[PDB]
Design a protein around this ligand. Structure first.
Ligand code: CLA
Ligand code: CLA
Ligand code: CLA
Ligand code: CLA
Ligand code: CLA
Ligand code: CLA
Ligand SMILES: CCCCCCCCCCCCCCCCCC(=O)OC[C@H](CO[C@@H]1O[C@H](CO)[C@H](O)[C@H](O)[C@H]1O)OC(=O)CCCCCCCCCCCCCCCCC
Ligand SMILES: CCCCCCCCCCCCCCCC(=O)OC[C@H](COP(=O)(O)OC[C@@H](O)CO)OC(=O)CCCCCCCCCCCCCCC
Ligand SMILES: CC1=C[C@H](O)CC(C)(C)[C@H]1/C=C/C(C)=C/C=C/C(C)=C/C=C/C=C(C)/C=C/C=C(C)/C=C/C1=C(C)C[C@H](O)CC1(C)C
Ligand SMILES: CC1=C(/C=C/C(C)=C/C=C/C(C)=C/C=C/C=C(C)/C=C/C=C(C)/C=C/C2=C(C)CCCC2(C)C)C(C)(C)CCC1
Ligand SMILES: CC1=C(C/C=C(\C)CCC[C@H](C)CCC[C@H](C)CCCC(C)C)C(=O)c2ccccc2C1=O
Ligand code: SF4
Lengths: 81, 742, 218, 73, 41, 203
């Protein structure tokens, strides 16, 4: 199951979305997207040990978008291939 | 910024405010002086905005009133489960439901009313219920009346909890105004916590309890020997013998092998041929999907965790060149006015209840729902009346928002200001499309009546005369029947049987559903429906738009909501108020919804409901007369209002004679309404003056002066008796006819 | 000065005078701005104390008949998991000297003579050691903080006499208290998923950890 | 026949009630003493003093046309 | 009871308590003496 | 002052002057002073009828179990046949209690008015408090008329607390007959054998 295609997608869907939320490529708690889809910084109040601003909300938020997207890729590829 | 703001002990829990009746209003706190004080005592009882100007105490009053309403509904559900537990034949109906009628009300043998305890079957006497609770409990997997008694006492426990919470959130810890103004958190916890987790919990019930018990009920197993609902959870081999996908044990859920759950989570579609109700593998996949979708939608808005949406930022970015500064201030509308949110919520709940009515005759969700025609007619009719009442109340509280909460300084050049700026165009073009619909539907009915009266059947709008076939509906019904083959692959059958995919489902020798034809008669009555809905929209939207002012009365917002008139000036300003438009839209809701349920009752008694004999022949209740008689008003009076009323008037001396009594008493309440509607206050005031003189002569004058009812109150009493009498007339006629022929 | 999972909203009221004041409050539950009946800064640290001490009696008590049965100090009829011990008579019922419905009435009679006394000391401290109760009402007076009475009965070894010693020992009570709540919640989910007691769940995982984890066992 | 003769007596008595009430409160009443100076068939007297809808004697005739229709029906 | 009995003495409660007693009495007359069309006394 | 709920503040209307006062008024129905004197009078005759009730329920059925007397059970005692019919036993009792409780009705309304015997005016009751009539017919031993008030209050407190145990007992005998269909002495001896199981949850 470790080398199966379900595990490799769901790891990479979660890892890349956490990479996007940490390296300033995705919306997070400490940075907002406007109507022009432009990342502007904000102070949400949440304090962690990350210098970039990644908090406990974003690792639950990007894990969920690692999972909502990741479920659809796995079952999209299951019905197709 | 979203967090809990409450404060402790706002008002002391005392009975000294119970003793003074008009404590909430300053005018009624002086005590009574006329008999109109009693009517303004009830009229201003729930009107919390007229009591105080502070929105915080208003919102606390509304929250504890919600808890009192929840307590009343839980008391009602406790009663209906206690009536199933003690005063029903639910086990007898559950043994075989194709011959025993659902009954859950026993009357007391006192004054001859013991004939109302009729032979419903199963060795039981009582009122045959049409509320659908028996099929609902069969779909819930309820096997014994001990489970009904447990649900009744649990509902009583929850009713005590709602009463305790209503006392708690007004007298011990009541929330402040910014707690209620956290609408993003409220939507996040209603979408995810209420509608998402509620659908998920009912999905878990419909995986563990409803599905195996209802599978055993399709196998002819006696419900006294069916294993109890916790035995499927405990002995999972007993659950695995009915569905082999349970033998894997939650490992395909977390490894995304959801297709291995294809044994019990299916996209079948259609009805169970054993029972005539939707599949619970589809209703469990439905609830799991709307739960994995409402919980996703509940993570949308911004509370206090950074991620989310401020919905003011959603609104204020939605602005267009045809509007300019639109959608701005609507957040300030919907967070500082309870009536605006009440208008939107009432419109969605009423329209949703109409969705419920259509999505239950057409896709019957409960086992043996469709073949019990009394349940189908009563459920559709009840939800149409509730939906029409809630959309008229939506327009009512829209108009109350205009007359009492619309601030014009905060709303400049937005959508609402511009809709008020061209309200003559809206009401005039609505007036044109209403008159056009009225001629092109009802004058088509008058034309059919005239040429059928003049001996010209070829000059009519029939299926044999000039045809008016609904080609868009007849194409959308073919598109929904020929869907599984190409546009919706993964479906075993089609969504509903009323589309055209065959599958003549016969349950108990009675027709559950079949392909519903749509012809010239359906075109005419759907244009009647569109016309009546449009006219109801015309009075109601005219009352919303002209609540502030008019060309007639430019200071109408100062006069209020429940004012009668300005006076006999400007030719007469009678019923200028927005309340009077709600009052007239109540009549147009009667007209609209009554023709809707009349079209429903005749359309499915003629083309759906019936019996199937040998060699596949279908005999309906009124065989094939909707296509030829429902195009004339004489057919509606004759083959519907006279032929089907031949069981509400000769039901006397039988168990259905209370329907005859309430049919006649409903005619009484309707003709009683015409006393209040057609008359006015001053006549009754001078007649009461003569009666007061006769009381002064015999020294029996009350100090509370007898007064005639107010003009707003006289119209309210007249429309209340009109709706009560007419709706009770249709209730009695429906529940006598379709019980008698069902 | 260890601080984890904190926010500027959370440090406005969590100033460090609490025993387990590590700043963990993302939802904002002990806010004194909207203090009410049960969501308030006076009941919530005291709620964590009573839920902590019942879980430390709970996490130790749900594993002690299973550990003592493997080492051979109790009979095997009582060496049973916690769920099949009369608590949930579906998954298992053990015959005591009374049926558990009668034992529940005996429970809330003795809890009602113990937690009603604990209730009214929270609403007013020291107001219970005035009425006569079996000649022992003088010891049941309590301190100002209702979580720690520290009388002749609840501190009958007198451990923690120094104020600096008692305050640092209160940190060890809540941290062992919080671990026990996650243990009982951990005991609850393992009883439904695995269907076997928690000491057998530890012994199954200690042999083959890659084949007896949460992912393999349901 | 007894019961419908009391229906007939109800119809004549209530029509006579509205019509005698219109004829004798024609000049004025305690709600409005100057009904004679407003003519016979005036609409109302305004929403003030509680409400004066159908106060005129023509309106009592109007309300008793429904009662003669019900009576003769 | 200086105000609880005042609420119990209000017009809707006293109408409910009297007509509850009144319909309670007339039903119980109609049980032990039913179908009464002629007063024999 | 002993109180029912030792942390709670006692109510203002229950000042401890009444016998058996322990501050138990959560619903506060004795808040009115005029209704409190009626309810104390209601509690006195409730206490003494239940103690007379408990001596006709639990005393002769204990003698029925021990074989001292062959009296029937208290639930089926009214069903038995006597020399007077039970329908017309009531109207003898109603007439006899229209003089017993109707003359007691005047003492609650007007104190010190029905203390004089109407047939013979020399006979009178030696009583000064409402609900405690005294005299030879009701207090023939004179124990209820003492000079000291602390002993007199405790003896009236002893009367109330003995009463309210029986009001739990006669109500307890009613529900035990509805649930177990067995005499309460036989419910006691069934409970005295195995008290762990023979309870309300024995079903
Ligand atoms: C490898 C990636 C990939 C691929 C190729 C697919 C492919 C598939 N997905 Mg998928 N999906 C993906 C990514 C992808 N997904 C991601 C990133 C998301 C997360 C948001 C989703 C979430 C998802 C949803 C929510 C749905 C699918 C469904 C489908 C099917 C498309 C059905 C269709 O054409 O509807 C055509 C539909 C219309 C033309 C109109 C629909 C209007 C609606 C009903 C109102 C197909 C098997 C559907 C399905 O049935 O799965 C089997 C479905 O329910 N997927
Ligand atoms: C996830 C938490 C959650 C959930 C489940 C709900 C659920 C509900 N809310 Mg609530 N609400 C919440 C949080 C939540 N709320 C938040 C965060 C806000 C503050 C911004 C509000 C403020 C709000 C107000 C102001 C009102 C509600 C109302 C409602 C009710 C909907 C009306 C109805 O008939 O529904 C169906 C009803 C039921 C199914 C009854 C369920 C009742 C049980 C006891 C659960 C309710 C307790 C609690 C909310 C969740 C406990 C979960 C528990 C089961 C473990 C329902 C009880 C309305 C109402 O009726 O007021 C009383 C109302 O207008 N909500
Ligand atoms: C909120 C609803 C809900 C709840 C409370 C349950 C409760 C249960 N499920 Mg689940 N389950 C649900 C939704 C629900 N399920 C849905 C909608 C599906 C479809 C994916 C299933 C399908 C499912 C299977 C396949 C199994 C469970 C099992 C379990 C049990 C152990 C898991 C646990 O308690 O955590 C427990 C009785 C297991 C069990 O013991 O079956 C009774 C089991 O093997 N569940
Ligand atoms: C979600 C539901 C909802 C909400 C919250 C409210 C809330 C309110 N409504 Mg209402 N409204 C709604 C839906 C609702 N309504 C619907 C369904 C309609 C269409 C009928 C309207 C039409 C509307 C108008 C026309 C007005 C309001 C107004 C009121 C306010 C106070 C009314 C009052 O004191 O009660 C008074 C309650 C009664 C008089 C009880 C009478 C009940 C009916 C009318 C008769 C009995 C029906 C019963 C089923 C028959 C039994 C007969 C039997 C006893 C013999 C309050 C803001 C009034 C206001 O001023 O708003 C600020 C008002 O003018 N409402
Ligand atoms: C059967 C009784 C009846 C009829 C004929 C009407 C007729 C009318 N109502 Mg309705 N209505 C009624 C009862 C009636 N009403 C009652 C009970 C109330 C009191 C609550 C209302 C109050 C009222 C409101 C408050 C509203 C209407 C409006 C209208 C118009 C709807 C548009 C339409 O159909 O145009 C077509 C006209 C007809 C179908 C009438 C028959 C004409 C025939 C077909 C023409 C052939 C005759 C020929 C020329 C003769 C030579 C129409 C003039 C609405 C309106 O004026 O705006 C659209 C409006 O807003 N109604
Ligand atoms: C003023 C009109 C009127 C009159 C004179 C009567 C008088 C009578 N009716 Mg009544 N009745 C009436 C209105 C009237 N009814 C109405 C309005 C209803 C409908 C609610 C009924 C329905 C009714 C019931 C159901 C019963 C009576 C009965 C009776 C008798 C009452 C005997 C008794 O002790 O109680 C008496 C002959 C009882 C009787 O003995 O029937 C003859 C009985 O069965 N009636
Ligand atoms: C449980 C349901 C009973 C809740 C009663 C709560 C309450 O109002 O009592 C709490 C009340 C509050 O007391 C209030 O005091 C006011 C003066 O400040 C007035 O005297 C009110 O009449 C009185 O109700 O306490 C009482 O004194 C109890 C008597 C009223 C309750 C009667 C219950 C019937
Ligand atoms: C239903 C669709 C009717 C089409 C309407 C539609 O397409 O709207 C198009 C147009 C959209 O206007 P804007 O581009 O200003 O809209 C931006 C939106 O975000 C509104 O704020 O709406 C109107 O101007 C209303 C015109 C109704 C015209 C009368 C129609 C009845
Ligand atoms: C105070 C209070 C406070 C606030 O107010 C709140 C509340 C809660 C309301 C309260 C409380 C209440 C209560 C608890 C009540 C109850 C009571 C009772 C139980 C009584 C009885 C009471 C009782 C009684 C008198 C009894 C009596 C009895 C009798 C006569 C008996 C008799 C008899 C006998 C001998 C035997 C024989 O063989 C038979 C007979 C004949 C049968
Ligand atoms: C500390 C640190 C680190 C680490 C970090 C990490 C690694 C993280 C992780 C994290 C993660 C890894 C997370 C995850 C999460 C997840 C989640 C959050 C989930 C959720 C879920 C949900 C949302 C649900 C689900 C679902 C779906 C989706 C569909 C249907 C079915 C279900 C319902 C099941 C590093 C190394 C960098 C460095 C040093 C420091
Ligand atoms: C009849 C009528 C009245 C008079 C209606 C009245 C006076 C209401 C009568 C209510 C009841 C019947 C009187 C009050 C009853 C008391 C509770 C006393 C109880 C007595 C018996 C009912 C037991 C109007 O005021 C009116 C106003 C505007 C348009 C039409 C009309 C209208 O048609
Ligand atoms: S009749 Fe009544 S509502 Fe009409 S104008 Fe006159 S006062 Fe106003």
């Amino acid at each position: 199951y470790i080398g199966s295609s379900t595990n490799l997608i769901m790891v990479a869907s979660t890892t890349l979305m956490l990479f996007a939320g940490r390296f300033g490529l995705a919306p997070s708690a400490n940075r907002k997207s406007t109507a022009g889809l432009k990342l502007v910084d904000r102070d949400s109040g949440l304090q962690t040990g990350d210098p970039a601003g990644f908090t406990a909300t974003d690792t639950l938020a990007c894990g969920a978008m690692g999972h909502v997207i990741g479920v659809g890729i796995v079952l999209g590829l299951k019905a197709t291939a | 910024e979203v967090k809990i703001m409450v404060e402790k002990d706002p008002v002391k829990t005392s009975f000294e405010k119970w003793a003074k009746p008009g404590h909430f209003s300053r005018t009624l706190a002086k005590g009574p002086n006329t008999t109109t004080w009693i009517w303004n005592l009830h009229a201003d009882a729930h009107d919390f905005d007229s009591h105080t100007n502070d929105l915080e105490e208003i919102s606390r009053k509304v929250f504890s009133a919600h808890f009192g309403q929840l307590a009343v509904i839980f008391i009602w559900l406790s009663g209906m489960y206690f009536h199933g537990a003690r005063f029903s034949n639910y086990e007898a109906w559950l043994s075989d439901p194709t011959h025993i009628k659902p009954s859950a009300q026993v009357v007391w043998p006192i004054v001859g009313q013991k004939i109302l305890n009729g032979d419903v079957g199963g060795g039981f006497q009582g009122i045959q219920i049409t509320s659908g609770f028996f099929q609902l409990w069969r779909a819930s997997g309820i096997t014994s009346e001990l489970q009904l008694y447990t649900t009744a006492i649990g509902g009583l426990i929850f009713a005590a909890l709602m009463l305790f919470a209503g006392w708690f959130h007004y007298h011990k810890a009541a929330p402040k105004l910014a707690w209620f103004q956290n609408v993003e958190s409220m939507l996040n916890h209603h979408l995810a916590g209420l509608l998402g987790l509620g659908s998920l919990a009912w999905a878990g019930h419909q995986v563990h309890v409803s599905l195996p018990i209802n599978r055993l009920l399709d196998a002819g197993v006696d419900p006294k020997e069916i294993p109890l609902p916790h035995e499927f959870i405990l002995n999972r081999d007993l659950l695995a013998q009915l569905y082999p996908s349970f033998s894997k044990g939650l490992t395909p859920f977390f490894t995304l092998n959801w297709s291995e759950y294809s044994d019990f989570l299916t996209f079948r579609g259609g009805l169970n041929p054993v029972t005539g109700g939707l599949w619970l593998t589809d209703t469990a996949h439905h609830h799991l999907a709307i739960a994995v979708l409402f919980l996703v939608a509940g993570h949308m808005y911004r509370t206090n965790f950074g991620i989310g949406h401020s919905m003011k930022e959603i609104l204020e970015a939605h602005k267009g060149p045809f509007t300019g500064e639109g959608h701005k201030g609507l957040y300030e509308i919907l967070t500082t006015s309870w009536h605006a949110q009440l208008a939107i919520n009432l419109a969605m709940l009423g329209s949703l209840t109409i969705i419920v009515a259509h999505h239950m005759y057409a896709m019957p969700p409960y086992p043996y729902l469709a073949t019990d025609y009394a349940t189908q007619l009563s459920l559709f009719t009840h939800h149409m009346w509730i939906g029409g009442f809630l959309v008229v109340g939506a327009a009512a509280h829209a108009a109350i928002f205009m007359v009492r909460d619309y601030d014009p300084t905060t709303q400049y050049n937005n959508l609402l200001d511009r809709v008020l700026r061209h309200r003559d165009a809206i009401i005039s073009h609505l007036n044109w499309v209403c008159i056009f619909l009225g001629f092109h539907s009802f004058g088509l009915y008058i034309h059919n009546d005239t040429m059928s009266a003049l001996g010209r059947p070829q000059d009519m709008f029939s299926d044999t005369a000039i045809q008016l076939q609904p080609v868009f509906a007849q194409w959308i019904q073919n598109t929904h029947a020929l869907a599984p083959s190409l546009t919706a692959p993964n479906a075993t059958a089609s969504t509903s049987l009323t589309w055209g995919g065959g599958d003549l489902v016969a349950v108990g020798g009675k027709v559950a559903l079949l392909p519903i034809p749509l012809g010239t008669a359906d075109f005419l009555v759907h244009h009647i429906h569109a016309f009546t809905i449009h006219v109801t929209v015309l009075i109601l939207l005219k009352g919303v738009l002209f609540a502030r002012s008019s060309r007639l009365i430019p200071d109408k917002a100062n006069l209020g909501f429940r004012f009668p008139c300005d006076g006999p000036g400007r030719g007469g300003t009678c019923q200028v108020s927005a309340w009077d438009h709600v009052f007239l839209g109540l009549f147009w809701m009667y007209n609209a919804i009554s023709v809707v349920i009349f079209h429903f009752s005749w359309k499915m008694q003629s083309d759906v409901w019936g019996s199937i004999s040998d060699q596949g022949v279908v005999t309906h209740i009124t065989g094939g007369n909707f296509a030829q008689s429902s195009i004339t008003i004489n057919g509606w009076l004759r083959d519907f209002l006279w032929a089907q009323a031949s069981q509400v008037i000769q039901s006397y001396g039988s168990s259905l004679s209370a329907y005859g009594l309430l049919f006649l008493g409903a005619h009484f309440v309707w003709a009683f309404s015409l006393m209040f509607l057609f008359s006015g206050r001053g006549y009754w005031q001078e007649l009461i003056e003569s009666i007061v003189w006769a009381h002064n002569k015999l020294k029996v004058a009350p100090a509370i002066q007898p007064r005639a009812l107010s003009i707003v109150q006289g119209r309210a009493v007249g429309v209340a008796h009109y709706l009560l009498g007419g709706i009770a007339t249709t209730w009695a006629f429906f529940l006598a006819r379709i019980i008698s022929v069902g | 000065r260890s601080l984890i999972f904190a926010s500027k909203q959370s440090l406005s009221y969590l100033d460090g005078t609490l025993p387990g004041d590590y700043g963990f409050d993302p939802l904002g539950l002990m806010d004194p701005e909207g203090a009410g009946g049960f969501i308030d800064p006076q009941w919530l640290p005291y709620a964590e104390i009573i839920n902590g001490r019942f879980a430390m009696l709970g996490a130790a008590g749900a594993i002690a008949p299973e550990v003592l049965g493997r080492i051979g100090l109790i009979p095997q009829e009582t060496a049973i998991p916690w769920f099949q011990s009369g608590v949930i008579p579906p998954v298992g019922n053990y015959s005591y000297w009374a049926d558990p419905y009668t034992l529940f009435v005996l429970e809330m009679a003795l809890m009602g003579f113990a937690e009603h006394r604990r209730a009214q000391d929270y609403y007013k401290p020291g107001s219970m050691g005035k009425q006569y109760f079996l000649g022992l009402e003088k010891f049941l007076g309590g301190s100002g903080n209702p979580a720690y009475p520290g009388g002749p009965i609840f501190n009958f070894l007198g451990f923690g006499k120094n104020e600096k010693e008692l305050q640092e020992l209160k940190v060890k009570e809540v941290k062992n208290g919080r671990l026990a709540m996650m243990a009982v919640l951990g005991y609850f989910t393992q009883a439904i998923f695995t269907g076997v007691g928690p000491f057998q769940n530890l012994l199954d995982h200690l042999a083959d950890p890659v084949h007896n984890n949460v992912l393999t066992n349901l | 026949d007894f019961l419908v003769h009391h229906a007939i007596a109800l119809g004549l008595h209530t029509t006579t009630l509205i019509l005698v009430k219109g004829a004798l409160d024609a000049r004025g009443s305690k709600l409005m003493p100057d009904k004679k100076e407003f003519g016979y068939s005036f609409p109302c007297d305004g929403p003030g003093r509680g409400g004066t809808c159908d106060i005129s004697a023509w309106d009592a005739f109007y309300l008793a046309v429904f009662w003669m229709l019900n009576t003769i029906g | 009871m200086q105000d609880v009995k005042t609420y119990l003495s209000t017009a809707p409660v006293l109408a409910t308590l009297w007509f509850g007693f009144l319909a309670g009495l007339l039903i119980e007359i109609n049980r032990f003496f039913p179908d009464a069309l002629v007063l024999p006394l | 002052r002993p109180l029912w709920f030792p942390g709670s503040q006692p109510p203002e209307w229950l000042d401890g002057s009444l016998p058996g006062d322990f501050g138990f008024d959560p619903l506060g129905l004795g808040s009115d002073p005029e209704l409190l004197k009626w309810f104390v009078q209601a509690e006195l005759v409730h206490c003494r009828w239940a103690m007379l009730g408990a001596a006709g329920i639990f005393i002769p059925e204990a003698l029925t179990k021990a074989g001292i007397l062959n009296t029937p059970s208290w639930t089926v005692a009214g069903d038995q046949q006597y020399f007077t019919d039970a329908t017309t036993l009531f109207v003898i009792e109603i007439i006899l209690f229209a003089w017993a409780e109707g003359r007691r009705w005047a003492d609650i309304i007007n104190p010190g008015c029905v203390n004089v015997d109407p047939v013979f005016p020399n006979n009178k009751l030696t009583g000064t408090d409402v609900g405690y009539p005294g005299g030879l017919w009701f207090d023939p031993l004179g124990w209820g008329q003492t000079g000291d008030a602390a002993k007199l209050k405790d003896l009236r407190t002893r009367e109330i607390k003995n009463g309210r145990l029986a009001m739990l007992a006669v109500l307890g005998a009613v529900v035990q007959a509805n649930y177990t269909h067995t005499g309460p002495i036989d419910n006691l001896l069934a409970h005295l054998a195995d008290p762990g199981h023979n309870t309300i949850f024995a079903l």
